[PDB]
Structure 1
Amino acid sequence: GWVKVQKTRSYFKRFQVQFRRRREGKTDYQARKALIIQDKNKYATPRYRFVVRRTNKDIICQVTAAELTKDRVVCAAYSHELPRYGIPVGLTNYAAAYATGLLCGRRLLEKLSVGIKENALAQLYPGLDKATGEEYHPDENENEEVHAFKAFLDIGLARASTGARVFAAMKGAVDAGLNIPHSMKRFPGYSKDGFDSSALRDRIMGKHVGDYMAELKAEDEETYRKRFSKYIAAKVEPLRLEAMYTKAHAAIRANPQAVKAKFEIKKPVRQARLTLKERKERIDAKKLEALKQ
């Protein structure tokens, strides 16, 4: 009972290393292909994929166009920007996704608009003025002359579970003005019978947190202290959540322009490579450790 080894030089010689992104697993190559296959006739005309990545403490939205090398991140808004816009806590809930979306969309429409400096873009496409759950497809209506900037959705590798955070970021961009192809069946409240404005009007307002916060205080205040600690110090009571969301949405739509925040580039020690002549020496000392003993 003593067996063969899988990692033979034969296995290694034939190993076909996957693409660096595929090995890491961040990017699914098959979807990227279908999202980025611009029909050849158009040529240079660029294609926008609305990446909505999800992370433990942040939700990242950026509108991107893939050139032969760069992915040309056009304009980007992340969850960490939202406390500046007035939401102190809950920077990764469904409601915060519908805000991350307005943050990206309204920045994109204005950035294109200031360069245009004419009767175009945001004045042509204010979009839904307020955050409401009604179905709104921006390009479905007039779409006169300058068409709404349409970007296709990139769910990443995350799974399209009914009413996931990533779906609600898409609504946020749609609220801003960017037409993003959508059906809203995934959105909660879309029973085959109908789309519930309510299921969206409440989740977009962060009332999912409100039910739990109030219930937690009654059944077990001590758990509610540990579970929602940041919410308590911030003073956003479950009742106050609705007001916070309306104000933030109002500020986001009116003044999207982002301001630069400074970054400190700390350098880790990064003990450098041992010099090659010294590298041979380490074996030479070891040889003495075996010979002289």
Structure 2
Amino acid sequence: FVKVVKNKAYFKRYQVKFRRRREGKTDYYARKRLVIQDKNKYNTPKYRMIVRVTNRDIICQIAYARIEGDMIVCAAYAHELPKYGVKVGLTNYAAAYCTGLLLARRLLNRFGMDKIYEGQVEVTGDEYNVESIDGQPGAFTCYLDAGLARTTTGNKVFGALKGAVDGGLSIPHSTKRFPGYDSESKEFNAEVHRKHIMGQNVADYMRYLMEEDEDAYKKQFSQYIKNNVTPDMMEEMYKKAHAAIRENPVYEKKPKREVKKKRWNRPKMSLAQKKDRVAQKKASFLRAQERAA
């Protein structure tokens, strides 16, 4: 045979990693360099802009760390986009830009700095950086959090970054990772970045799949056909959504329904029940052995 490797001594000596490390959600080596404040700043908050891209959503939220747990100050999800007129295609780059913009303008609405630092009204995709206006309250700066995303060129985390930057946040960045930075020649095609923001990567592919095989087109873009969006509706829809977001970025909470108090799972049984279980198990095994023998 072979020695059992997950031995009782193995479980005695075994040390766990952190809970979020075991779940996989948190990179602590990146987290400590992101989130810790210099000690001569003395309880001054250090705001970070967390982007998490999901299968059906994009979570964009701004947070600073206290001891008992980091406070979220503002949030903006991709499933708030049908309020602003994006019915469908919620996990793509354009929706990432829209929710970054919504996070930015909603935070500026919370702090009362809407009419100052309005940022790029006309989307271009250049180097944009919010200069702080003297005599006014200074521009909000925060630091981009990507978590565990491989930050290569064209990432929707950098799409949400461009959304917050054009919304008016002073996030430090550079145009190496935006879609359009040509790798071999080291320049940045802002028109390509702009059509990626406005979604012509999806609309051009939609016009592509309309050509050769339309049931594959319906298999790819199903609810685009159901929600009546077409490649000539595409760019104007995102521009109307940008105008709607920059017009009214405040967020309502849904009124809470009164609970029925229904226990949807199975609660933890006491020690009396699980001692009685094995008592009648031993009684059952003995009374089933004595007759079968």
Query: What is the TM-score when the length of structure 2 is the normalising length?
Result: 0.92
**What corresponds to 2:140 in structure 1?**
149
1:230 to 202, 223, 226: 223
- Gaps (5+ residues) in structure 1? 114-120
Deviations 1:35-76 (A, max 9, x none): 112110011110101001111100010111111112110011
Q: Does 1:60 align with 2:59?
A: yes
Give the equivalent residue in structure 2 for 1:285: 280
Q: Give the Cα–Cα distance (whole angstroms) in 1 for the partners of residues 220 and 163 of structure 2.
A: 28
| Percentage of matched positions with identical amino acids | 55
Aligned pair 1:180/2:171, yes or no? yes
CA distance in 1: counterparts of 2:107 and 2:95, whole angstroms: 18
Q: Quick check: 2:153–2:181 contact (8 Å CA) kept in 1?
A: no
Q: Secondary structure at the match of 2:60?
A: strand
Question: What is the CA-CA distance between 1:122 and the residue it aligns to?
Answer: 2.8
Calculate the aligned-residue CA RMSD, in Å: 1.5
Kindly tell me: are residues 268 and 232 of structure 1, through their superposed partners in 2, closer, same or farther at Cα, counting changes over 3 Å?
A: farther
Q: 1:129 maps to what in 2? A: 121
Kept in 1, the 8 Å contact 2:179–2:196? The answer is no
Q: Are the equivalent residues in 2 in contact too, given 1:131–1:249 (CA < 8 A)? A: no
Unaligned runs of 5+ in 2: none
- Is 1:254 matched up with 2:247? yes
Residue aligning to 2:45? 46
What is the SS of the residue equivalent to 1:90? coil
The 1-side partners of 2:116 and 2:243 are apart by: 19
Contact 1:136/1:174 (8 A) holds in 2: yes
Aligned residue identity for 1:61: C
Q: What secondary structure, in the 3-state scheme, does the structure 2 residue paired with 1:99 have? A: helix
Q: Match of 1:138, SS?
A: coil
The corresponding residue for 2:160 is 169
| 2:269 paired with 1:274 | yes
1:262 deviates by 4.0
Q: How does 1:200-239 map to 2 (within 5 A)?
A: 200-239=193-232
Contact 2:84 2:244 in 1 (8 A): yes
Give, in whole Å, the separation in 2 of the partners of 1:75 and 1:148: 16
CA distance in 2, matches of 1:26, 1:224: 35
* Partner residue in 2 for 1:101: 100
Q: Please state whether the residue corresponding to 2:59 is helix, strand or coil.
A: strand
Looking at structure 2, the residues matched to 156 and 180 of structure 1 have their Cα atoms a distance apart, in angstroms, of: 16
Query: Deviations 1:193-228 (Å, cap 9, x if unpaired)?
Result: 422111111011011111111111111101111211
Whole-angstrom distance in 1 between the partners of 2:119 and 2:80:
22
Deviation at 1:291, TM superposition (A): 2.4
Name the amino acid aligned to 1:194: E
Letter in 2 for 1:209: V
How far did residue 263 of structure 1 move?
Answer: 5.6
Cα deviation for residue 130 of structure 1 reads 2.0
Asked if structure 2 preserves the Cα contact closer than 8 Å seen for 1:149 and 1:178, the reply is: yes
CA contact (8 A) 1:85 1:252 kept: yes
The whole-number CA distance in structure 2 between the counterparts of 1:219 and 1:47 is 52
Following the alignment from structure 1 to structure 2, what is the Cα–Cα distance between the partners of residues 224 and 190? 30
